Design a protein around this ligand. Sequence first.
Ligand SMILES: COc1cc2nccc(Oc3ccc4oc(Nc5ccc(Cl)cc5)nc4c3)c2cc1OC
Length: 273
Amino acid sequence: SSISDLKEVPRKNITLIRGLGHGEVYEGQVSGPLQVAVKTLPEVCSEQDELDFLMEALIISKFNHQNIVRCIGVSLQSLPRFILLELMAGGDLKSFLRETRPRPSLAMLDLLHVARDIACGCQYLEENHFIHRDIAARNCLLTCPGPGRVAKIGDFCAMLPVKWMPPEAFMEGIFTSKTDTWSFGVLLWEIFSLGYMPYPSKSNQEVLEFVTSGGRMDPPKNCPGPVYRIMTQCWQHQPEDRPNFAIILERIEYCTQDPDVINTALPIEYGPL
Ligand SMILES: COc1cc2nccc(Oc3ccc4oc(Nc5ccc(Cl)cc5)nc4c3)c2cc1OC
């Protein structure tokens, strides 16, 4: 991947409309009128921050897949520097699951399609030997809120997302393609719980101890068995025993053909608790 590959958009053509993410993220506009999301590099930054920014642009730009957020161009010759991505109007998946919970909206088939979309994106990353390292609902994005939505993969010690990591990751600092399989399991759980925090009432240390000694989340409310089985297969203790993403995709697709899965009602939350 050469800088030659990055499409430089002259700064005059770029307009920031509103902020999106608390570098920073904005919705913007490119005139030749194109709708984009913009990632900025802070003007005050390291020499290594500059390398990272370039590197992210280089890596995102070489990916060509329907379920990975596309880099549409860059603006690196003006300050502050921009990486331009396709605007995903539906927002992040976690917010979406939370805002669209049924009240007295979403069916199983809708959740399964998001799951398939992300599994399909993860398979492509595995095929190109890229380790994401933070597959999670907060990092997935939707093209729109409606029935035709497509989910895509993005990316925005007591810092590590322990609740999404396999034991060898947080104990041993080992990352491989089977890392993202574990994280995908936890994502599945986030999807089928309709956006709850994993390990509901546990702290990071409690999760570490719980998971290192064989503990696993219970299925989300009304979660069908075959979907839970995919989760528990993603959470096999040893990396070798976890399925790759071709197998996961196949299993999600078979779930999607099972009437007993797709006819299952989602739980409805009673406001007064
Ligand atoms: C409508 O709201 C949003 C739309 C968005 N549309 C496109 C992109 C958004 O956020 C980002 C911002 C920066 C990003 O950098 C990356 N990089 C990336 C993408 C894929 C892979 Cl596999 C690795 C890195 N994804 C990003 C996603 C968006 C964020 C939004 O709200 C926070």
